[PDB]
Structure 1
Amino acid sequence: GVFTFEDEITSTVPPAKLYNAMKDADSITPKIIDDVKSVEIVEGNGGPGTIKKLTIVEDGETKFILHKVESIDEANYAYNYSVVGGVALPPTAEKITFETKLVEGPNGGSIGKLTLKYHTKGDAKPDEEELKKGKAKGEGLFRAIEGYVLANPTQY
């Protein structure tokens, strides 16, 4: 099954900047996110379809996560990817999709929508703690991109 969740968020950073820095996540994320050590392309140019392998360290053990770039839409300031391999996918989870879409906010900032789509196998529903972790991870990546923009204003 597919179980979709949406959270609304806010940022002081304008949406064009945030969108441009989302597309630089491969380089931003391992600097800012401690446990993210590297992101390499397995196949593709970085566009929709691209498979990426992330190396992380959790509890001082090296682990690997697989991401697929799903879609990137400048007209909706939208950047979308899926976890398709590694720790976040227990046996009844087939894939977890993270979408981020941005609109113009008040005061030169942004309103964000974070969508999490949790694809289960068969009639399985998503586990509630998994959901909770999925949501935290999604919000974390967003704040990492945001934090980077805020701390490095001349780059965007």
Structure 2
Amino acid sequence: GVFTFEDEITSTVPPAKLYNAMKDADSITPKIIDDVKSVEIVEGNGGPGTIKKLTIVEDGETKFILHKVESIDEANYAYNYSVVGGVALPPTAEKITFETKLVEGPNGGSIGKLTLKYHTKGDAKPDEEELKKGKAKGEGLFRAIEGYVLANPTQY
């Protein structure tokens, strides 16, 4: 089955602008996040079903993570993807889905609605520790994109 967790975060960047930057996560992420070295398309054209391979060098040792693009809704500022392979994925999980939806902020910013879905093998409830890592990962990407936009205002 599926275990679901919601999280909400705010930004000072307006949603249309953040969303445009998200589309460039593949090039933005390696620059901002020290451990991320590259993001490469294994299969597909960037649309749903696309598989991406992230190369990371935590410590001094290389690691791969695999993402699958699930859906996009540009009009509603949504990007959804799943972790589908790599040591990030525990054996009790078929996949971990990260959904991001941006809405308008009261003062010219955005509200990020982050949804985390764990598809477990035999309805294995996620660990306090596992979730913690998942919450941090989703929050980390959002901050990486936001940070790039705030640091490079002419870009978007």
TM range (shorter): over 0.9
Give how far 1:123 is off: 2.7
Instruction: State the Cα deviation string for residues 81-126 of structure 1 (Å, max 9, x = none).
Output: 1100011211111100011100000111001101110111013111
> Residue 24 of structure 2 aligns with which residue?
24
Distance across 2 between alignment mates of 1:41 and 1:125: 31
SS at structure 2 position matched to 1:80: strand
Q: Are 2:153 and 1:142 equivalent residues in the alignment?
A: no
Distance across 2 between alignment mates of 1:74 and 1:94: 27
What is the total number of aligned residue pairs between the two structures?
Answer: 156
The CA RMSD measured in Å over matched residues stands at: 0.8
Give how far 1:155 is off: 1.1
List aligned pairs for 1:108-127, cutoff 5 A. 108-127=108-127
Instruction: State the Cα deviation string for residues 5-37 of structure 1 (Å, max 9, x = none).
Output: 111110000000100111100000000000000
TM norm structure 2:
0.98
Q: Tell me if structure 1 keeps the 8 A contact 2:2–2:123.
A: no
Moved over 6 A (4+): none
Give how far 1:128 is off: 1.4
Instruction: State the Cα deviation string for residues 54-103 of structure 1 (Å, max 9, x = none).
Output: 10011211000010011110121001111000112111111000111000
Distance across 1 between alignment mates of 2:10 and 2:18: 11
Q: Are 2:42 and 1:42 equivalent residues in the alignment?
A: yes
Distance across 1 between alignment mates of 2:8 and 2:64: 29
Distance across 2 between alignment mates of 1:113 and 1:50: 23
Q: Are 2:14 and 1:8 equivalent residues in the alignment?
A: no
Unaligned 5+ segments in structure 2 are none
Identity %: 100
Unaligned 5+ segments in structure 1 are none
Distance across 1 between alignment mates of 2:77 and 2:102: 5
TM norm structure 1:
0.98
SS at structure 1 position matched to 2:89: coil
Q: Tell me if structure 1 keeps the 8 A contact 2:28–2:148.
A: yes
